Design a protein around this nucleic acid. Structure first.
Lengths: 7, 56, 209
RNA sequence: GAUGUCGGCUCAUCACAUCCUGGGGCUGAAGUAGGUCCCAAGGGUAUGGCUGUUCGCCAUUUAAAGUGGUACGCGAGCUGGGUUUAGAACGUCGUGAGACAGUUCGGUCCCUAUCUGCCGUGGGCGCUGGAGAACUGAGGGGGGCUGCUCCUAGUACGAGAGGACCGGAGUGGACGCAUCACUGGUGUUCGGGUUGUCAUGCCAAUGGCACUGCCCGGUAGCUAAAUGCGGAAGAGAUAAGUGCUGAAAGCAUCUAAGCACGAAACUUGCCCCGAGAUGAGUUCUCCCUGACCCUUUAAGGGUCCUGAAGGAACGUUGAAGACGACGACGUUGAUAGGCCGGGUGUGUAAGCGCAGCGAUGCGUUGAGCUAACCGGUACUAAUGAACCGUGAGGCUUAACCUU
RNA sequence: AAUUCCUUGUCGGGUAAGUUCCGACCUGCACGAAUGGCGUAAUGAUGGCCAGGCUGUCUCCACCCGAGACUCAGUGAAAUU
RNA sequence: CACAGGUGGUCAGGUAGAGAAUACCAAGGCGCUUGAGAGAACUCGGGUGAAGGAACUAGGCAAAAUGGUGCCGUAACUUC
RNA sequence: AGGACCGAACCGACUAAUGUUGAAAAAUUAGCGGAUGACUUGUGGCUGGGGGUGAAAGGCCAAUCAAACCGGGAGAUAGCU
């Protein structure tokens, strides 16, 4: 949900 | 990272075909004490090549 | 023509009158005894089998002892074969000295290179090391990519990877012959040759020429 | 009920519409140097400034800094600058919440590899009696780059300026392999200097700890920046191309018959692997020359005697090694440790004496100590045995012994 | 310009070479005066840029000391299917 | 969880030191409940490095470097 | 004298690496900020869910927050799988 998995 | 299919019992057995243990071929016999022992190792009673190494 | 089997003694230098230092590898070439001669009629090709050095009598197996007995020569530490160039004739039991290289002026030296054991791609294939900083995560000396995407879908044969390095047959060609000492059974060749001290070396005249 | 994205890094692989090198036709090709087209994919094919950039511009190189495919190759290989969450501003739009493919600062990249694949390395069995070796080479990989200078020759060519083809020699760049003699790095297993502190009763002398306390040197090994070598020549068949003879077609014509040249491509030549090459090959050497019983009577089973060549195991081990493997040796013995001698390194030990009030200096003294190195030495450990492996090796046919 | 789309604007400085930076110019796409304008010493784990020193960040990696990885004995998971 | 975490007050030795920092120690308490070998790649935590010295990179990230006391000396600018 | 300076305890959390089926459902290691103050800390108390508190991030309110948790309406409804 934060850009790249899982940032 | 992980399997896509469950390996078979056959595949498990094949991998274990090299896991068998090997027994000692033979045990040496002390010339004086007469008991059997691993080659190049002292006997249980402290003998080695019939010399009666420390046994305390 | 035929070569000879020698032992790597070590490396030294030869000082010339003109103030030049020549790095030389000292090779001990003892008399090579012919143990078998092969011909087209029996073996389908021409060659000679030679032995050198000495071996413990108690450590020579009976099959090997019979082979030496037939040729009437003392047992050596090994057996090597050399092809004949359609103009060379040798007889069983003949001894070949280092004088064979009296006027050769250039030889090929073959031996077993030093064994490096399991080696990484950086050492084995001169792979470029990745960044030591700037965010690199546990990928400082790793190979990196080893292929392309779905299209090939496989790693190609012959891909350069980590593995055993050294301890294999290696030949160095066109080495100048510095000196031949029949009395001391020594052969000095400019430069280095494969293998460690005391290893077996095969010396043949340069094929390139 | 997820097929991770721009760029970079690492590692690549193929295509040829060829950037360089190689071979040619034409030229408004004198030469040098070019233009254009054909053949050719063997190898080679920049570093930096700016920007997240690909790209591009610029600086300076190079024989050349090729064009493309590979999920615009490659994040279960790395990165996270760009893009694309949540914070916050500027410009702009909106009354406002907010918004913009406008800008700006900040902002978690997980996975121990089952299978395929790949790089290495073993076990099993097979190859038809067993065993120890040396080979043949079907097949498969590696390698294949090129500058500059000099001679030919200031010759050919050219009004001059300028300036060769062909051929030969030398010396470099990049790349690859090997090696440690040299030059060096490393050398927490060698020696020394030195700070703080604790301890060995104390002095003296040493040891522990403080990143090896901090440092100065340095053996062996490993190693590059160190020093040796390599790309080839040659041969076969060709590509584009050039030809000879020669008809169809009285001529002409490189072609239809026949014949000769022709490139870094192709097949060899060079290096390495290689008989699981089940098409399992060849050569040399070595070992085994018992006696019975049963029966569904055969490539049959069992008992007794026998246990070879050789192997394995165990032990001491190696410039061999992840483990297996591989090599050396096991008392008829230098395999390892120790020991002896030497070398090397460090740099004048301790004790004692002398000089000085003392810190210290000097003599004994290039002393003491000294790892992996060199040459020697059975002092220690590598034990007699035991174990595995057998007892002449199927059938058919042919030629031979008894051509 | 934390604001400028065109745009790496133009010129100068700095560099062998500067889409960033600094100083000017003003054609302000779309600054502007308490949702403040323009200056400002000091302050800042704040943004951008340039120097000296320093270095394995790099050219280009080499060796060494330790903990894992590897082997033996004991114990003994996981995602997935 | 026999878990590298969290948890208020009190006591405060010696040498060096400005010090409750830091190093080595006293009293006292511990060696952290798998070991034994080997000395490959690779990963982790460190040491050293020829010549060059930011050529790295989005960016000097990381690393290296500076580091104490006394005296001397100390710019633009400034709200002094 | 000082929301003064350097720096332990103490309170914080700027950078990097490790870890990411971790020793740990946010920590470790090396650096880093404040450290007489708008400081920090023990004990007890008060504020309750469209409400609290908030030097303001939609932060926090028991590992849960653009409307906590527990029970109930309840087998809400689901033209969708």
């Amino acid at each position: 949900x934060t850009x790249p998995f899982x940032x | 990272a992980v399997q896509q299919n469950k390996p078979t019992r056959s595949k498990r057995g094949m991998r274990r075909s090299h896991d068998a243990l090997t027994a000692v071929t033979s045990l040496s016999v002390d010339k004086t004490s007469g008991e059997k022992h691993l080659r190049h190792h002292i006997t249980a009673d402290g003998y080695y090549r019939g010399r009666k190494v420390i046994a305390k | 023509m035929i070569g000879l089997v020698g032992k790597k003694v070590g490396m030294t230098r030869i000082f010339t009158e003109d103030g030049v230092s020549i790095p030389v590898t000292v090779i001990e070439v003892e008399a090579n005894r012919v143990t078998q001669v092969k011909d087209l009629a029996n073996d389908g090709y021409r060659a000679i089998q030679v032995t050198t050095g000495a071996k413990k009598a108690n450590r020579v197996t009976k099959p090997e002892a019979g082979h030496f007995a037939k040729a009437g020569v003392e047992a050596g530490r090994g057996l090597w074969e050399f092809r004949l160039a359609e103009g060379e004739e040798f007889t069983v039991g003949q001894s070949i000295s280092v004088e064979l290289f009296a006027d050769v002026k250039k030889v090929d030296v073959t031996g077993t290179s030093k064994g490096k054991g399991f080696a990484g791609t950086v050492k084995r294939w001169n792979f470029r090391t990745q960044d030591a900083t700037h965010g690199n995560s546990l990928s400082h000396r790793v190979p990196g990519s080893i292929g392309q995407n779905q299209t090939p879908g496989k790693v190609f044969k012959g891909k350069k990877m980590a593995g055993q390095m050294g301890n294999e047959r290696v030949t160095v060609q066109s080495l100048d012959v510095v000196r031949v000492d029949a009395e001391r059974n020594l052969l000095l060749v400019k430069g280095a040759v494969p293998g460690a001290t005391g290893s077996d070396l095969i010396v043949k005249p340069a094929v390139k020429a």
